[PDB]
Amino acid sequence: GPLGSVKPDPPENVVARPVPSNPRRLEVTWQTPSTWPDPESFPLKFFLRYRPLILDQWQHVELSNGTAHTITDAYAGKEYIIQVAAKDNEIGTWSDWSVAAHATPWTEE
């Protein structure tokens, strides 16, 4: 493609785990795609967006080099659809929203 800055494949190992010590924290962890070689030499910008299952509010978080995002803005009583995208810091090769992780922080009741 763009010879080098090829559109990064959908992030892998994308698992949103709920913190039992926080009824609103969602440890959204992930990793670079299997197709992606070195995540260091190629700063992969991850675009995370968490929208409540009761409100159509698509958030916008940029992770220049984040692989473990912790969001305390997640509702424990409602599911959160956190979609993760990929892109290259060098050349703008925006990748459409792929992985749509489903999670729910510690439902303290």
Q: What tokens does 54 get?
A: 């009761």
DSSP character for 67? S
Question: DSSP E strands: which ranges in 12-98?
Answer: 12-18, 26-31, 46-52, 61-63, 68-71, 80-85
This entry's atomic model was obtained through: NMR
Contact criterion met (CB below 8 Å) for 79 and 53: yes
Determine the Cα–Cα distance for residues 22 and 38; give it in Å rounded to an integer: 34
Question: DSSP E strands: which ranges in 54-108?
Answer: 61-63, 68-71, 80-85, 99-103
Q: What tokens does 62 get?
A: 């940029």
Contact criterion met (CB below 8 Å) for 103 and 16: yes
Give the other-Cβ count within 10 Å of 77's Cβ.
Answer: 14
Determine the Cα–Cα distance for residues 44 and 85; give it in Å rounded to an integer: 10
Amino acid at 94: W
**For 1-109, which CATH class?**
mainly beta
Q: Is the dihedral of CA 40, 45, 6, 97 positive or negative?
A: positive
